[PDB]
Design a protein around this ligand. Structure first.
Ligand SMILES: COCC(=O)N[C@H](C)c1ccccc1
Length: 282
C-alpha cells in the first residue's frame, strides 16, 4: 500500500502495536559473540543491546578492538551510517578513536546528558573554548571552536587532533536537544528541520566517512533518524515514490543492528516524518 493511506488505515483501526510486533517477529537474528565476552562487560551500556559480529565497527587496536557500534550500509540509497550507544565513562576515548579512524565529518546526538533524573551518556565533548579535553588512552585532543544554540538544537564546531601524528580535523556536532523525556514529539517539523541541517552540512555525503549517530542505546531515536533520511532519499531517486515501503526499509536496516525503533509510537512517528517531509521536498 501507499504510505499516507496505510497510515490513516492503521490509525482508524488502532493496530500500531500489531504492526510493530510483526516487525519484531520478522527481524533478523545474527550472532553478537564479541560483545558478550567478559572482558567487554564495561564497554556495554545495556546487556540486551549489542552489535552483530558481521557489521560491528572495529577499533584499530590489537589489544581490544571492541566498541558497541554498527555499520548500517544502505545499498540502493547509497547512504551509510554508524549507529552507536551514548559513550560511557570508560569508552569516551574509544568513541573519538572511531570518529578519527572512520573519517567521519559529523556526530549526531539525539538525547540529553541527563534525562528522567539519570545519566544517559557521558559528557564527552568540551563545554568551554579554553578547557580542552585530552583522551590519554587513545592519544587524542578535542577542542571546542564555536557553538550555535537554537531553540530545538545546537551545532558545535570541534577540532580533533591525533597527538601521535599532529594531524587535525574539523568535526561538526549536531545536538537535538528537545526530544521529550517520555513519548515522541507531537509534530515532526523540528526533527525534519534538524535532519535538513545535517544534510546541508555535508556530513551525510560520500566524500566523507559515515556519520556517527547516537542516543542512549543507539537503536530508538537513532533508528528514527536514519530510517527517515533513507526513505526520503529513495522517494527522490525512484520513478514511483509511492513504491517506498517503510516497513521493508526498516527490516533491511535491522539486518545490520538489532532493535531499531523501540516502540509502536516511534514507528508511527517515523511514518509521520516521512509523510510530511515528502511534501516539503517538492
Ligand atoms: C554562527 O554559526 C552559524 C553556524 O552554523 N555555526 C556552526 C557552529 C558552524 C557550522 C559550520 C562551520 C562553523 C560553524
Amino acid at each position: 500500500m501507499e504510505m499516507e493511506k496505510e497510515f490513516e488505515q492503521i490509525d482508524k483501526s488502532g493496530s500500531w502495536a500489531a504492526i510493530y510486533q510483526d516487525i519484531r517477529h520478522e527481524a533478523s537474528d545474527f550472532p553478537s559473540r564479541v560483545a558478550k565476552l567478559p572482558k567487554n562487560k564495561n564497554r556495554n551500556r545495556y546487556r540486551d543491546v549489542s552489535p552483530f559480529d558481521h557489521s560491528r565497527i572495529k577499533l584499530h587496536q590489537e589489544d581490544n578492538d571492541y566498541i558497541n557500534a554498527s555499520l548500517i550500509k544502505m545499498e540502493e540509497a547509497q547512504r551509510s551510517y554508524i549507529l552507536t550507544q551514548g559513550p560511557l565513562p570508560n569508552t569516551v576515548g574509544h568513541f573519538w578513536e572511531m570518529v578519527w579512524e572512520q573519517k567521519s565529518r559529523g556526530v549526531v546526538m539525539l538525547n540529553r546528558v541527563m534525562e528522567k533524573g539519570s545519566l544517559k551518556c557521558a559528557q564527552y565533548w568540551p563545554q568551554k573554548e579554553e578547557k580542552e579535553m585530552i583522551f590519554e588512552d587513545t592519544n587524542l585532543k578535542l577542542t571546542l571552536i564555536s557553538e550555535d544554540i537554537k531553540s530545538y538544537y545546537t551545532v558545535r564546531q570541534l577540532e580533533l587532533e591525533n597527538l601521535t601524528t599532529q594531524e587535525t580535523r574539523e568535526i561538526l556536532h549536531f545536538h537535538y536537544t528537545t526530544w521529550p523525556d517520555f513519548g515522541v514529539p507531537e509534530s515532526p517539523a523540528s526533527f525534519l528541520n534538524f535532519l535538513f541541517k545535517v544534510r546541508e552540512s555535508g556530513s551525510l555525503s560520500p566524500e566523507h566517512g559515515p556519520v556517527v549517530v547516537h542516543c542512549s542505546a543507539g537503536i530508538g531515536r537513532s533508528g528514527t533518524f536514519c530510517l527517515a533520511d533513507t526513505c526520503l532519499l529513495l522517494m527522490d531517486k525512484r520513478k514511483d515514490p509511492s513504491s517506498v515501503d517503510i516497513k521493508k526499509v526498516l527490516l533491511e536496516m535491522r539486518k545490520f543492528r538489532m532493535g531499531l525503533i523501540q516502540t509502536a509510537d516511534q514507528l508511527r512517528f517515523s511514518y509521520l516524518a516521512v509523510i510530511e517531509g515528502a511534501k516539503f521536498i517538492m
